[PDB]
Amino acid sequence: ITSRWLLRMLPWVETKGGAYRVNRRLTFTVGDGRVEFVQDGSTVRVIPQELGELALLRDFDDAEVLSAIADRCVQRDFRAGETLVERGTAADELHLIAHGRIGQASAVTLDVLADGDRFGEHALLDEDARWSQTATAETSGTLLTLSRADFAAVVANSPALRSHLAAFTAADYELKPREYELSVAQTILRVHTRVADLYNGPMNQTEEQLRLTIEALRERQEHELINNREFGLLHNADFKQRIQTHSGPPTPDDLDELLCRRRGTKFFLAHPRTIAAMGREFNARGLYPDHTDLGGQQVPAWRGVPILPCGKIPITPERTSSILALRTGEEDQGVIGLRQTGLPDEYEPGLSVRFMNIDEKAIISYLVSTYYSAAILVPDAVGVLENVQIANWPR
């Protein structure tokens, strides 16, 4: 029953066969100290050529070997405050940071690794490797892991890798299309035959129940567009586009930075609690931002970019939320809503309700289905400001 801003703001394009294709160019350089990954929603995998940044694999440029090694790493997720490695424990895994920040405390907190950093190099070659630092995850993120035994197996498989290892001991264009498959929001509406036969004259309780079902399906559509893992703006956003607040509350400098990272931002999406926190920051700064009109409706905005409330953005137990800045369009590479219309039996242009059967207990079943998905044409179309403290008040 709440407002679904993402449903009414995302342009909808018609897919053919319930699938869409987005052509991705992933420019990366070898030797700059940062490993680049390929991200398909929440699943990430290291580019094989970038594996070479690792010294023990520098100048090795055999596609088979690199592809095998890249295929043999395992993705892991870490939460805030979680310890990944402990001092004293023998080192046996190479960890490549794909997202999040990880603080390493030595025997003296050395520093904080970030996206594209590596720790666990020496663990690959020798068995004497021992963790001398404790890695505490300051922020939630992902991490690729290459175990020593698996790498040893890959070495024992390819003679070229063996020879290169024995010898060492003494902008790239990569096109890879991304395929989006339409997801389904489905439900079964069970209407008793008596309710369909009698209560249908002045108002149809069958039609009202169908309306409630459609509203629930639309709410689920919005919740999935925001929070789904495969597709979904919160998770299917580039790791470079995800920013951290400078202080923790959503100060206007953070909004300026969020607008800096991409051209032609269309709007902001945030929880109403987050919008209240942003308003508190505006009042503290002493500035009164203007309000702009979309669709004949006035709405708060920052620098002319409307800020739209979305209750589907999660609030963590630590009372920290996130803000989304996103541009929408097809002619301008942005975020589109993939949806197929012209279904065989449409109650609504995107919907399909079809009679299933009548049970022995005289209960009619209807199948209400809708097909939807989200596509982000270019990486710099959705930016996420994370760890936004929304329970901060003046003191």
Q: By C-beta, is 41 or 252 nearer to a second copy?
A: 252
Q: What is the number of H-type helices and E-type strands within the chain? A: 8, 24
**Closer to a second copy by Cβ: residue 31 or 344:** 344
Asked whether residue 29 is marked as a ligand-binding residue, the answer is: yes
By three-state DSSP, how is residue 60 classified? Answer: coil
Nearer Cβ to a second copy (4/99): 4
Q: Which stretch binds a second copy (CB under 8 A): 96-104, 109-117, 167-175, 299-307?
A: 299-307
Closest approach of Cβ 124 to Ca ion, in Å? 18
Asked if residue 142 belongs to a known ligand binding site, the reply is no
DSSP secondary structure letters along 212-254: HHHHHHHHHHHHHHHH-SSS-TTTSS-TTTEEE-SSSS--HHH
Answer yes or no: is 115 a known binding residue.
Answer: no
Is 53 annotated as ligand-binding?
A: yes
Interaction residues for Ca ion, span 46-105 (CB under 5 A):
50
Q: Which is nearer to a second copy, 5 or 37 (CB)?
A: 5
| The 141-147 sheet, strands edge to edge | 74-78, 141-147, 93-97, 118-119
Q: CA angle, 291 as apex, 285 and 293 as ends, to 5°?
A: 165
Minimum CB separation of residue 115 from Ca ion in Å reads 12
How many amino acids of this chain bind Ca ion (CB under 5 A)?
2
Estimate the crossing angle of helix 272-285 against helix 252-260, to 10 degrees: 110
> What's the closest the beta carbon of residue 99 comes to Ca ion, in angstroms?
16
Query: Which of 89, 291, 314, 330 is the binder for a second copy (CB under 8 A)?
Result: 291
Instruction: Please tell me what DSSP assigns to residue 28.
Output: B
Residue 63 tokens, joined: 């596609």
Binding mask 75-94 for a second copy (x = CB under 8 A): --------------------
Q: Please state the separation of Cα 300 from the chain's center in Å.
A: 26
d(CA 159, CA 180) in angstroms, rounded, equals 38
Q: Which one among 43, 67, 109, 193 touches a second copy, defined by CB under 8 A?
A: 193
- Binding residue positions for Ca(2+): 29, 32, 34, 50, 53
Binding site for Ca ion (CB under 5 A): 32, 50
- Binding residue positions: 29, 32, 34, 50, 53
